[PDB]
RNA sequence: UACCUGGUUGAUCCUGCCAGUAGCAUAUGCUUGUCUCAAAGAUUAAGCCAUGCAUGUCUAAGUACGCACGGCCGGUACAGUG
């Protein structure tokens, strides 16, 4: 199941400001960039061996 | 620029030092218009020190949920500056 829809967002409401909601950057999240970095690390191992 | 001169005697010649002479460094005295470089709390006390300053630092690339500011149409998990 996804984790990005269950992030506890804090509500920011201040006088004279348009209200909004703030959510943290999820850490240790699996992302296409993370998988690409892992793939490149294995690829570098492969190239070194070859 | 490898240099000497006065002083022992009634005169002489020496020995010999004292004094003179030139630079250099530090202090000081008097004087000082321009301009260029330029040393400067070493010597006595590695004596004592008020106060201020003299070592901090962020990139696209460690950690941003400080509205601190702020989005473009925003509750895209994370816009961005910080």
Curated annotation (Swiss-Prot):
Post-translational modification, as annotated: Ribosomal protein S6 is the major substrate of protein kinases in eukaryote ribosomes. The phosphorylation is stimulated by growth factors, tumor promoting agents, and mitogens. It is dephosphorylated at growth arrest.
Localisation: Cytoplasm; Nucleus, Nucleolus
Superkingdom of this protein's organism: Eukaryota
Task performed by this protein: Component of the 40S small ribosomal subunit. Plays an important role in controlling cell growth and proliferation through the selective translation of particular classes of mRNA. Part of the small subunit (SSU) processome, first precursor of the small eukaryotic ribosomal subunit.
Assembly and oligomerization: Component of the small ribosomal subunit. Part of the small subunit (SSU) processome, composed of more than 70 proteins and the RNA chaperone small nucleolar RNA (snoRNA) U3.
Family to which this protein belongs: Belongs to the eukaryotic ribosomal protein eS6 family.
Protein name as catalogued: Small ribosomal subunit protein eS6
Full protein stretch here: 151 to 200 of 249
């Amino acid at each position: 199941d996804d984790v990005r829809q269950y992030v506890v967002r804090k509500p920011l409401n201040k006088e004279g400001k348009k209200p909004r909601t703030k959510a943290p950057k999820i850490q240790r999240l699996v992302t296409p960039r993370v998988l690409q970095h892992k793939r490149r690390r294995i690829a570098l191992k492969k190239q070194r061996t070859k």
